[PDB]
Design a protein around this ligand. Sequence first.
Ligand SMILES: *[C@@H]1O[C@H](CO[C@@H]2O[C@@H](C)[C@@H](O)[C@@H](O)[C@@H]2O)[C@@H](O[C@@H]2O[C@H](CO)[C@@H](O)[C@H](O)[C@H]2NC(C)=O)[C@H](O)[C@H]1NC(C)=O
Ligand SMILES: *[C@@H]1O[C@H](CO)[C@@H](O[C@@H]2O[C@H](CO)[C@@H](O)[C@H](O)[C@H]2NC(C)=O)[C@H](O)[C@H]1NC(C)=O
Ligand SMILES: *[C@@H]1O[C@H](CO)[C@@H](O[C@@H]2O[C@H](CO)[C@@H](O)[C@H](O)[C@H]2NC(C)=O)[C@H](O)[C@H]1NC(C)=O
Ligand SMILES: *[C@@H]1O[C@H](CO)[C@@H](O[C@@H]2O[C@H](CO)[C@@H](O)[C@H](O)[C@H]2NC(C)=O)[C@H](O)[C@H]1NC(C)=O
Ligand SMILES: *[C@@H]1O[C@H](CO)[C@@H](O[C@@H]2O[C@H](CO)[C@@H](O)[C@H](O)[C@H]2NC(C)=O)[C@H](O)[C@H]1NC(C)=O
Ligand SMILES: *[C@@H]1O[C@H](CO)[C@@H](O[C@@H]2O[C@H](CO)[C@@H](O)[C@H](O)[C@H]2NC(C)=O)[C@H](O)[C@H]1NC(C)=O
Ligand SMILES: *[C@@H]1O[C@H](CO)[C@@H](O[C@@H]2O[C@H](CO)[C@@H](O)[C@H](O)[C@H]2NC(C)=O)[C@H](O)[C@H]1NC(C)=O
Ligand SMILES: *[C@@H]1O[C@H](CO)[C@@H](O[C@@H]2O[C@H](CO)[C@@H](O)[C@H](O)[C@H]2NC(C)=O)[C@H](O)[C@H]1NC(C)=O
Ligand SMILES: *[C@@H]1O[C@H](CO)[C@@H](O[C@@H]2O[C@H](CO)[C@@H](O)[C@H](O)[C@H]2NC(C)=O)[C@H](O)[C@H]1NC(C)=O
Ligand SMILES: *[C@@H]1O[C@H](CO)[C@@H](O)[C@H](O)[C@H]1NC(C)=O
Length: 1771
Amino acid sequence: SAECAVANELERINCIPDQSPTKATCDQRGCCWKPQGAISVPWCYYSTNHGYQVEGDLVNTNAGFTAQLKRLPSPSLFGNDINNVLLRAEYQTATRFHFKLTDQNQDRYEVPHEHVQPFQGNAASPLTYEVMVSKQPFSIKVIRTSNSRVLFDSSIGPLLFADQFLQLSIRLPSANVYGLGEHVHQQYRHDMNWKTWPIFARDTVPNGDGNNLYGAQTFFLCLEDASGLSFGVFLMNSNAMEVALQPAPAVTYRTTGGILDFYVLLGNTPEQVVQEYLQLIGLPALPPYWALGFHLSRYDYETLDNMREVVERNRAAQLPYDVQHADIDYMDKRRDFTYNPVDFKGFPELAQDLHNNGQKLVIIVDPAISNDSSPSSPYGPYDRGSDAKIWVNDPDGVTPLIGEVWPGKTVFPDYTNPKCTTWWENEFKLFHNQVDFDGIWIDMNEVANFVDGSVSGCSTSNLNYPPFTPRILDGYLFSKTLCMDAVQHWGKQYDVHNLYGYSMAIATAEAVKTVFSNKRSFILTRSTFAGSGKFAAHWLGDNAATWDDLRWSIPGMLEFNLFGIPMVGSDICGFLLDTSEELCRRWMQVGAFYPFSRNHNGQGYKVQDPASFGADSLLLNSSRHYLSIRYTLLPYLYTLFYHAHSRGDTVARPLLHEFYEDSNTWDVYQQFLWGPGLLITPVLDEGAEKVTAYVPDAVWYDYETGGRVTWRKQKVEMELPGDKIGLHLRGGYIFPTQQPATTTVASRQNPLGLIIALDDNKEAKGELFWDDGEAKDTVANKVYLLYEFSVTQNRLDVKILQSTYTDPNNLVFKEIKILGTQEPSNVIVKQNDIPVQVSPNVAYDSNLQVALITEIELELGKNYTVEWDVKIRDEEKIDCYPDETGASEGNCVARGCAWEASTSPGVPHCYFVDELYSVSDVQYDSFGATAAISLKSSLYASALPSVPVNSLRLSVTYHKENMLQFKIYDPSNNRYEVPVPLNVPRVPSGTSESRLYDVLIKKNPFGIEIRRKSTGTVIWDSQLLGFTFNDMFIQISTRLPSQYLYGFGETEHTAFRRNLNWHTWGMFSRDQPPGYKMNSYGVHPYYMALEEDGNAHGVLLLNSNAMDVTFQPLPALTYRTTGGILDFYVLLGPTPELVTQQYTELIGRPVMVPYWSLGFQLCRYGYENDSEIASLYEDMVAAQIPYDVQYSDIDYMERQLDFTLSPKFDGFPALINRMKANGMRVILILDPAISGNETKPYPPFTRGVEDDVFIKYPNDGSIVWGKVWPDFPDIFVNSSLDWDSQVEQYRAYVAFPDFFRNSTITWWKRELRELYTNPQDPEKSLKFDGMWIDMNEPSSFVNGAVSPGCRDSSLNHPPYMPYLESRNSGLSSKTLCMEGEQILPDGSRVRHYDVHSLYGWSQTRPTYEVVQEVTGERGIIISRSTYPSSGRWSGHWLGDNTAAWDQLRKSIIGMMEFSLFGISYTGADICGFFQDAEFEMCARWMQLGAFYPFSRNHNSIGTRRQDPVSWNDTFVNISRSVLETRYTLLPYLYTLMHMAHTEGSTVVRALLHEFVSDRVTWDLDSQFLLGPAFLVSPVLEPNARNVTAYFPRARWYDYYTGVDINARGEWRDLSAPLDHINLHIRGGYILPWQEPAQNTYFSRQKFMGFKVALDDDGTAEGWLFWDDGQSIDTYEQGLYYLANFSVSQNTMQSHVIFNKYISDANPLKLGYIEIWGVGSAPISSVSISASGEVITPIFIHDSATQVLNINVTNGNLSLHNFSSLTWTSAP
Ligand SMILES: *[C@@H]1O[C@H](CO[C@@H]2O[C@@H](C)[C@@H](O)[C@@H](O)[C@@H]2O)[C@@H](O[C@@H]2O[C@H](CO)[C@@H](O)[C@H](O)[C@H]2NC(C)=O)[C@H](O)[C@H]1NC(C)=O
Ligand SMILES: *[C@@H]1O[C@H](CO)[C@@H](O[C@@H]2O[C@H](CO)[C@@H](O)[C@H](O)[C@H]2NC(C)=O)[C@H](O)[C@H]1NC(C)=O
Ligand SMILES: *[C@@H]1O[C@H](CO)[C@@H](O[C@@H]2O[C@H](CO)[C@@H](O)[C@H](O)[C@H]2NC(C)=O)[C@H](O)[C@H]1NC(C)=O
Ligand SMILES: *[C@@H]1O[C@H](CO)[C@@H](O[C@@H]2O[C@H](CO)[C@@H](O)[C@H](O)[C@H]2NC(C)=O)[C@H](O)[C@H]1NC(C)=O
Ligand SMILES: *[C@@H]1O[C@H](CO)[C@@H](O[C@@H]2O[C@H](CO)[C@@H](O)[C@H](O)[C@H]2NC(C)=O)[C@H](O)[C@H]1NC(C)=O
Ligand SMILES: *[C@@H]1O[C@H](CO)[C@@H](O[C@@H]2O[C@H](CO)[C@@H](O)[C@H](O)[C@H]2NC(C)=O)[C@H](O)[C@H]1NC(C)=O
Ligand SMILES: *[C@@H]1O[C@H](CO)[C@@H](O[C@@H]2O[C@H](CO)[C@@H](O)[C@H](O)[C@H]2NC(C)=O)[C@H](O)[C@H]1NC(C)=O
Ligand SMILES: *[C@@H]1O[C@H](CO)[C@@H](O[C@@H]2O[C@H](CO)[C@@H](O)[C@H](O)[C@H]2NC(C)=O)[C@H](O)[C@H]1NC(C)=O
Ligand SMILES: *[C@@H]1O[C@H](CO)[C@@H](O[C@@H]2O[C@H](CO)[C@@H](O)[C@H](O)[C@H]2NC(C)=O)[C@H](O)[C@H]1NC(C)=O
Ligand SMILES: *[C@@H]1O[C@H](CO)[C@@H](O)[C@H](O)[C@H]1NC(C)=O
């Protein structure tokens, strides 16, 4: 159908809103019928035929435009359809659009609002909104010109305009709709799912069944999006109506009369929309100060005596109580303006009694007046009123309408009649003269008849029975109210029914002006309309004592604040039913924070006043406690009412009004604020002692303690005991306080105070409004104090913006409380720049960081300034003098620092006290954040080493959900950046929703904060003192999450964990045996830290200049570098094994080593002649000690010259070939430095000079010479000569290649190619399999260059010399000059000073490429010097150890650290390198070293042989045994190397990587894991035959026996004889293994196997990767086998993921399967499915130890054919 063209079933507008859906009715109305569809979806919907058209054009006017609309021909719905309608639009203000639709010919009813008056002016300019009117069918659309977004759209449905039916539908930009009342929505946000709400004032209980209540409010707010952009709509119409929400999203107003008079209000935030609305309808009244106290009331006190007893009881309990209410009891025969002469005799005396105790009296007054006035018994109110003719009349307009209420037959005053107001005033005056009351409570002002219409009933008119009736209760407009044809001054009851309460409140406000002189009073009303808040407060009606009503109280209160009636609350402890102690207690707790706080009970229920529950009840104690807190904060509350009254702010506020940037705050309705500063979190559930609460993104302080909470922008479970409610102060605000008393009268004479809650930038602001609190128009007559407080830079400024009032009580501020500060000291108070004599006494709690400045008196009404200076603790002290020499008080005062000789060790003597840089221009983007940093203190910065940089930029980038980068650099000048490429995402994916972190840039001092979203833990905090960015001195510090830090190397440490007791460690490559506090071969600026909850993160600083790190016990970490920029990468975790996978993804994953390189290796410096290496080979085979690689040191080279062959090793080439034929492999050593003193042809140097590959001076062009190993030709070398003498007499001059350069790369590769294939003689060709590149620091035996010496000392001995070795010899010690020049690939020139630590890294990749070219296979590189991203192409060995006992444990620590650094192939020299090995030590070391990934026995020259065959038979047996274990496990070990290469897993893992929950594992460094499954527990001590090992919580099987040991989380003593190493397998894992042999070549041709360790559940899992083990890129080119295996339900299944290597032509045989933990029951049978072939294997089950051994060698089963193995246990 074409008329029925509706895009979306959700955009259907119901055409039958009255009766049930029937095709008969729809066909009659002309609406399309479509019953197919979902629930609540309307089958009947209007067609395009319905509506109006604009005939002509938009005639313009002075205020806007006018348009004539005629009715599109269509069937009438309810009849009397107006045909000609006029539209008038008025651009009243830049943010307020008004339009009105009315009849063109006839005049209709319009609301006579007292405040809103007709607009006389011209159109405003410029406007923030655009109005576009569609001509056919007619529609109006308001558009936000700023972002071109439609806010109001009336096109979704037709305009309907009949006499007794008007309709308009509006499409909305979002579903965030708040407002529309008065009903119980049970939630602040509005459910847009086909819900309809009636609006018609009515006396009924707030049951919660969606019924019309006592008031009529048509305003709603809509929040467009997270920018804060918002708008509001208000309809000025007093007729009965209903509002229909639709999941379009869309709202629709359906009314029974009047005109459509709309206002659209725009604002940048929700609060601005509310302010716009309240400025239009009228600003709220300022209440008297006493009305903010607590109020007590009860329906039936029966007698005055009972009332008096309640008063006395509560007074005696000392409960904060100020106002006592009186219900209709006092009134005799419930008649107004009268009191009971007997039961309530003495009522006047009660009023006086209250006043003498500083308490108040509020009396109730009803609108209905009785008619029983006879000459015998006169009733004055009635007689005087009848004389004035001020009653509501019957339709005849003359006869008073008679209704029935409390007094019985009654008449109703017409408050819209001016004469009525005069009568009303007089009545109050006479009664006030009898009883001296203080305020008025008006009730049943809906109006409310106990009968329907009148005592005579209602006429049959279209007013009493209209054609359309909203979904009102009962269904009759005259039910429990007056007849709709009754006549008043403003019109008929049909039009003014919703205005009765409004009109009465106006009249009462007038009466008060006369009765009470210059004394604003209090009018509490029930019935309300828009604009009532200017005159009265409101209470939410007759609730019941249930847990639902408790919950519903909060959204009700929040909506009324929108409507401009801030003085509002519900009845505490319920009005109907009986309350329980818990409900009344939990209600008194939250009720203490209602704007209007009153306990009100009904008739015939248990007394519920707090003192009723007993003088020492928990309820009374709790009530007294929180009511005292309310009284302390009344100055703060009163000022909030001032801002509502003056500007239109809310008092009790929803979270979304402050924290709209987040979407988690757009639904909260169980938590609220007082103004912007105080968050209230109640318990609203029966029996609960915990709440789920959302904490928004701010600093929050616990009100009761003052301590900061750690929660931010997250949900929490809060522990709230029966007598506690959640209260928190927001940082950045100042709160005025006043010492509390039992009444407001006694409290306003007590001293004042301030609470200062500081924020992230250590700043706060506040206001105090002060006045008499009783007089009227104080603000209008400008008779009041207004203060403005502000804190910044440890200075408070009080400042009086208006002072025309003087307080008679001589009040003073006596205390100042500061939250989130360091200890304040030297407090100076001055008034108007005039010193005030005072002795401020400060008291600081160190843990909560809370201070109380007392002994001060700030006279209210005068300007002042209080300044303080702060004390720094000894743990937060940052060294201001890290220079090598010059430490003195004179040198500190100059730098601008403080000097204190701390007796405590470690604590610095000269510390920092001020900041050098300021922050500005902070901008947060979707995928980043930036800021400008500018030097403030030029002089002090200059005193610090080097020249200061002035302008800096901070850039933060959100690369991924778990990774981010932040960088600080000079935007004006290029400074050196490390040329090591990293792998970052090209397009940022740090989407706000997915990302694991948040960033915050702070000020005073400057700093960056990074926080983990899930737990709210801060993982990086830089707001410490010391940030410096000089040219050659950059410093920055961070606060560590916990005391656990692992990483930073390469430097020997006593442990895996780092000691943070004032320790400084340098980093700059040097040829120095690893030692304590000694810079070594590699520089890795990376750490991983554990948070206290066991979450983990990692941080990389990408910098290559010389540097150091200091560990303060704050915990704090400081970095100091000698150049470059600051470039940080952070990995968010969340587990210790995912930070390594994240790190290696960024730097590059480890290299895959050749299978043969996992065998055992032999090396020895001092090989005399070739025939010796031959002898070793033969002897090794004889004793059957398995080995795979034989190394050759500089001995094979002539005079230690590279690319030469010594005459002593003439047969070497032949030997290499013979060994290789038997499956052995050979690695050769190469040094980088090339000799320049050769007399005979030396191609390397000659061609190097021609290709210019050597490092030369900046411009001079001379080669920087040095002295390493190469010797001089034609001299005799005497070993006796001291080393110093040899370096000076025998060592030659050498040149160092620049490996960054393209020419150098070509020369180097060609030289290695000629080494493999000798061009001069093929007989001299050396067929190597890998390369060992050593002395690549670079390293020299002469500091700087050869003598004369170096040139530029500025670089050699820099301004700041990091804490390295020989700290007085400078950077050039044992290395090149720092001025040497190098050339990057792109041609740019750099200094050795910047790239020194990247020299080994620069050589590594070229070497790797050439080896893979000459050999045609994978190859292996081993490098001494390493830098982040070196593990991508090479392994590393832990350098020159010594044969000593402490060196065994140091090796374990070293290999765990290099795994974190992403270098998986690593190991130490077995049996030591220096000194001579000892039998026991060399034996114990052989056992340990059998489990290093790089397992090599290496010794120095002139030392006892350490080779397995250099000892006796006892050793040969120990060595052979352990090495056979190694060769057995190689398939498992090789699979581990594969996963690391492909996923970034670790091979030698720590225990905390697998068991992070056990905190015992956080300090273990004497045991380790290979992969997840294999635990190694060595003996590391002399003469020890037992080892104490900790077994984490799991199933641990002994490797040798296969028996499970019961040690789950316990220590145990393991037997460890000299010939044994303790090994254990973790249950739940499957290990592939293979039979051992002399070399891998032979072993790869034997049977495979699978040890299966079942867990407690009886499940196990494992992997196998298999390839050739030699070819390049086997995985990238897809020639490999990869499979995952699983064991469960007594069966094992193989899941080949990829197979292109294992075939029938190339089989991998499987022969043995051992299952551990199968249980004690005998095993009936075992079956193997070989590609559809069942095989019965040989088997044996020893139920003593529970191990099934399955043999299948005869089965001839290849792995590719295996599918599954099943075993059935005996029933
Ligand atoms: C309810 O409170 C009473 C009285 O407590 C005192 O007053 C409070 C307002 C607060 O200032 C407390 O620190 C005071 O102790 C508790 O009862 C005992 O009352 C006697 C006499 O006043 C007092 O000396 C004791 O110290 C109080 N007992 C204690 C502290 O154990 C009473 O325990 C509270 N109610 C409940 C249910 O615990
Ligand atoms: C108060 O109003 C009621 C209702 O109008 C009056 O009661 C009626 O009085 C008339 C005589 O005037 C009787 O014929 C009716 O039977 C009464 N109606 C009832 C009882 O429903 C009453 O007289 C008024 N009292 C006055 C004016 O003093
Ligand atoms: C408190 O301090 C303020 C700021 O110094 C004073 O306010 C100024 O008063 C002068 C009086 O001639 C006015 O011209 C200025 O407009 C005011 N504001 C500013 C910003 O200068 C105020 O007088 C002081 N109040 C005292 C001394 O009680
Ligand atoms: C090769 O080197 C070996 C070892 O240096 C030489 O012979 C032995 O040297 C050791 C001392 O290193 C002595 O203890 C032995 O007595 C030597 N043996 C002999 C038979 O002299 C050997 O001479 C060298 N020459 C070659 C192999 O040409
Ligand atoms: C290595 O140097 C030492 C020390 O200079 C030489 O030893 C001396 O040789 C002379 C030869 O005439 C003897 O008179 C001395 O007694 C030796 N000792 C000392 C302490 O002077 C040694 O000869 C050199 N070795 C060589 C050249 O092979
Ligand atoms: C191999 O040499 C080792 C080291 O000298 C011998 O070990 C010692 O043997 C004695 C006598 O049995 C024991 O008292 C010592 O405790 C052993 N020391 C160590 C460190 O174990 C060993 O006996 C020799 N083996 C052979 C077969 O001679
Ligand atoms: C493990 O070894 C330790 C250290 O040798 C043994 O403890 C000592 O045993 C001797 C036996 O004569 C006692 O004299 C010492 O007092 C013991 N020292 C300590 C610190 O206890 C221990 O008995 C061995 N325990 C085993 C194998 O379970
Ligand atoms: C063995 O490998 C297969 C294939 O990679 C794994 O199965 C997949 O598992 C993922 C993650 O649970 C699922 O999304 C896929 O649907 C699975 N693919 C299939 C069944 O073809 C399997 O989980 C691995 N087994 C073990 C124990 O890791
Ligand atoms: C696995 O099964 C095979 C076949 O039954 C066993 O090998 C045979 O062992 C017997 C006894 O030593 C010899 O007579 C045969 O010559 C062996 N055959 C071969 C081909 O070597 C083997 O011992 C079993 N393995 C285990 C650990 O039980
Ligand atoms: C070494 O092992 C062999 C083979 O088991 C054995 O015969 C010999 O006695 C062992 N030697 C020692 C000293 O234990």
